[PDB]
């Protein structure tokens, strides 16, 4: 996160750390959608151009964290993965279209004050909130700056959703319907963005109807971090909901 703040304790209880076994390292963010399922960015597991192809065995997931590096004794839960599921039509070749994946935990996690799932939007929630000008919140343990680093605690930033057209005209990368972009326009004089290490984390909104937090996006890609005239791109979660529903219902939640 660039230009964010330290999260408050229990602010994002659905936040998960994607952790590499050896060398031990922070791969990406992730979010808990139930006691057994985690949602992330597919490019966190598979990115052939960089020789990246992680298997269940290579990783661990850490839940209920605040600190980037301390082991939070009596707070955090660490789990092993039963199975990884990448969107069959994830496009690593050109533009990260369908940059999404589900992870099945080896055993369910017990909820607590620091651990609790977020909701997945339904067509109407999605319809009412996914509007230019509406703000969401992003969180993560990624880079503080474009290049220089790592925060000591979980960072948070609230950003506005931007009009599809301004999104398109900011990059030469081919934007699809499975993506949305977010940030402040340069006049707007107010910054913040996700950055490298932030992928897989959630873009969430609070419903004004029922007060619940919904995950609307997943941190996906960008060009540099917090640059003026540029924006962050997110996997559009409602659009990929059928797939999501489908894997959970075969592979059983």
């Amino acid at each position: 996160i660039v230009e964010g703040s330290d999260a408050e304790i229990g602010m994002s209880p659905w936040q998960v750390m994607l952790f590499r076994k050896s060398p031990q390292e922070l791969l990406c963010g992730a979010s808990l959608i139930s006691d057994r399922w985690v949602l992330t960015a597919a490019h966190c597991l598979l990115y052939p151009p960089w020789d990246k192809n992680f298997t269940e065995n290579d990783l661990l997931v850490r839940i209920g964290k605040h600190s980037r590096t301390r082991y939070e004794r009596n707070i955090e839960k660490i789990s092993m993965l039963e199975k990884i599921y990448i969107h069959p039509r994830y496009n690593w070749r050109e533009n990260l279209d369908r940059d999404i994946a589900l992870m099945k935990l080896k055993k369910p996690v017990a909820f607590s004050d620091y651990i609790h799932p977020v909701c997945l939007p339904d067509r109407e929630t999605a319809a009412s909130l996914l509007q230019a000008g509406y703000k969401g919140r992003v969180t993560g343990w990624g880079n503080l700056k474009e290049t220089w680093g790592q925060p000591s605690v979980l960072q948070v930033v609230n950003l506005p959703i931007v009009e599809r057209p301004v999104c398109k005209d900011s990059t030469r990368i081919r934007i699809t319907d499975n993506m949305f972009c977010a940030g402040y326009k340069p006049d707007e004089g107010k910054r913040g963005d996700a950055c490298e290490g932030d992928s897989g984390g959630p873009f969430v909104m609070k419903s004004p109807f029922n007060n619940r937090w919904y995950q609307m996006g997943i941190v996906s890609w960008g060009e540099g971090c917090d640059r003026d005239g540029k924006y962050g791109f997110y996997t559009h979660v409602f659009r990929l909901k059928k797939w999501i529903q489908k894997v959970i219902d075969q592979f059983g939640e």
Partner: protein
């Protein structure tokens, strides 16, 4: 667990369940041309 996830989904034990607010959640609601 999926659709609007679990059942208790999105309700934070230390904020929503206690009826407490986080420092910047207002900024979100005010953007939905002022929440609820």
């Amino acid at each position: 667990t999926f659709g609007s996830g679990e059942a208790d989904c999105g309700l934070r034990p230390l904020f929503e369940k206690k009826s407490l607010e986080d420092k910047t959640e207002r900024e979100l609601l005010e953007s939905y041309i002022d929440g609820r």
